[PDB]
Ligand binder design. Structure first.
Ligand SMILES: *C(=O)[C@@H]([C@@H]1NC(C(=O)O)=C(S[C@@H]2CN[C@H](C(=O)N(C)C)C2)[C@@H]1C)[C@@H](C)O
Length: 501
């Protein structure tokens, strides 16, 4: 008949929305039932009714109460709806009490599971945005005092010590409309190509906002029963790979800025191979002799870009790749985030100079590759990444000069539109620019690009992990995904068509 115990006042966790206010993580009022076993010991004849209302075995529930007969607090069931909780409270079983707290609900479910993340049973962020912005969303729990007897029965409220401070609303950079589009089209591409995993990243090249980030396979954060680590893998930020041919536009940017190269220059790639010591550079397509700079990207001649790299030096190429964020920390503060590796040399040997130029030796993520193409599309200005809505666009860094960036934009537009190019990446009504490639671990189908080519707004990267249907080539598997998703992204954002007659 006299013992004051402190009780936590759970705080209302902050709402998570997309960039337009569409709900993504909502704190839902729930009812948690707990029991005082000392009072349950006085009403044993009520146990089978209480056990059935809780969905528990009659004898197993009796064992649990008997084993905790000296305790004053045990959980019965957490996170019931207010209807279910009041149904058990209506039994008037001595020693059964209720707690009003909150539990997260995710309206979009698996569509944005990896980005939003999830909380645990204690309403604590444990993955994705929920963890990365946990202190912002969690608030501060309150403190209250309650009087319990020496047999554990609640008597009265003493006083409230500290009031609970609710969490703060957080608006993400994701556009839920684009997220739905990217989710389904990436899912359709895996089925059509017989692929098991993949990622797709959409970025606003002016603001650095991540407009969409989907990974396959995915999971429903509202369930998470029998969940495999394969589905919980945020591949766009975690899976590192050699970007290969997709970084040749950045080797070309260093060449165009050195003063020694122009798009009309010719490189002899015959016979499709090149001997560097014991190492032998080899192109996939070996049916070319002379190619201009655009033809080097269209044919993806590793020999052609290696000879250019030897002429300008690997340092100029490393500098461009470093400043656009390849192999660098993103600063997003996401859990499990992997940085990759951009190797550096005091004296770049001839072998490492070539492999750097056509994308071997270094490892990046799909987020880093999208960020790098965002800077190229943004007239050479790199804007830091953001998973939250950007109202005030930060002052970027001019990595590539606007003239050179504009020249590479046109070259990548020809990669998509010229004869023998990646025509499955064309967006109807628009001019699209990009570059296909393949990453190795068995392949990874890559396509990175942006649109409109003449005035870029949206950068996109499509990763398809091991197509089993036919052809692991990026121009065949990933480019059709780019076309469909970019078309919907341009329309939803009211980007005016630049390729109409
Ligand atoms: C770069 O990642 C590799 C090259 N990427 C490109 C590419 O995917 O377009 C070539 S593929 C080669 C050139 N074009 C042919 C094609 O696309 N079809 C016949 C459909 C095949 C290489 C794979 C580079 C590192 O080898």
């Amino acid at each position: 008949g006299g013992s004051v115990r402190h009780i936590a006042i759970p705080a209302h966790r902050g709402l998570i929305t997309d960039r337009n206010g569409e709900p993504l993580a909502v704190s839902t009022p729930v009812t948690t039932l707990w029991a005082n076993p000392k009072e349950l010991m006085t009403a044993k004849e009520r146990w089978p009714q209480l056990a059935a209302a809780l969905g528990q075995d009659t004898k197993l529930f009796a064992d649990r109460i008997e084993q905790n007969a000296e305790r004053e607090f045990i959980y019965l069931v957490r996170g019931l709806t207010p209807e279910q909780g009041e149904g058990v409270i209506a039994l008037k079983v001595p020693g059964v009490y209720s707690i009003e707290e909150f539990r997260r609900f995710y309206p979009a479910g698996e569509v944005v599971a990896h980005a939003v993340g999830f909380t645990d049973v204690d309403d604590r962020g444990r993955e994705g945005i929920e963890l990365a912005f946990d202190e912002w969303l969690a608030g501060v729990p309150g403190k209250r005092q309650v009087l319990k007897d020496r047999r554990g029965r609640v008597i009265k409220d003493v006083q409230v010590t500290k009031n609970a401070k609710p969490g703060k609303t957080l608006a993400l950079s994701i556009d839920l409309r684009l997220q739905y589009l990217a989710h389904r089209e990436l899912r359709n591409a895996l089925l059509e190509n017989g692929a098991k995993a993949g990622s797709l990243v959409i970025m606003d090249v002016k603001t650095g906002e991540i407009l969409a980030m989907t990974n396959q396979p995915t999971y429903n954060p509202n369930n998470r029963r029998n969940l495999q680590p394969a589905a919980m893998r945020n591949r766009a930020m975690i899976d590192v790979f050699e970007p290969g041919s997709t970084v040749k536009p950045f080797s070309m940017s260093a060449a165009l800025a050195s003063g020694r190269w122009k798009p009309s220059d010719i490189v002899d790639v015959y016979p499709g191979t090149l001997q560097i010591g014991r190492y032998t550079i080899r192109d996939v397509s070996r049916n070319s002799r002379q190619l201009d700079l655009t033809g080097i990207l269209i044919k993806s001649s590793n020999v052609g870009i290696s000879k250019i790299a030897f002429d300008i030096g690997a340092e100029s190429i490393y500098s461009v790749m470093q400043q656009v964020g390849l192999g660098q920390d993103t600063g997003l503060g996401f859990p499990g985030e992997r940085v990759g590796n951009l190797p550096n040399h005091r004296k770049w040997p001839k072998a490492e100079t070539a492999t750097l130029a056509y994308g071997y030796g270094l490892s990046v993520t799909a987020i880093q590759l999208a960020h790098a193409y965002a800077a190229l599309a943004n007239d050479g200005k790199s804007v830091p990444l953001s998973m939250t809505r950007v109202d005030r666009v930060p002052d970027g860094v001019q990595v590539i000069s606007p003239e050179v960036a504009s020249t590479v934009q046109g070259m990548l537009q020809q990669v998509v539109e010229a004869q023998g190019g990646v025509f499955r990446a064309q967006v109807p009504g628009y001019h699209a620019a990009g570059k296909s490639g393949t990453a190795r671990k068995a392949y990874r189908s890559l396509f990175a690009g942006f649109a409109p080519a003449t005035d870029p707004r949206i950068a996109m990267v499509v990763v398809i992990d091991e197509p089993s249907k036919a052809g692991y080539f990026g121009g065949l598997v990933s480019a059709p995904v780019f076309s469909k998703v970019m078309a919907g992204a341009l329309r939803l954002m009211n980007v005016p068509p630049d390729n109409l007659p």
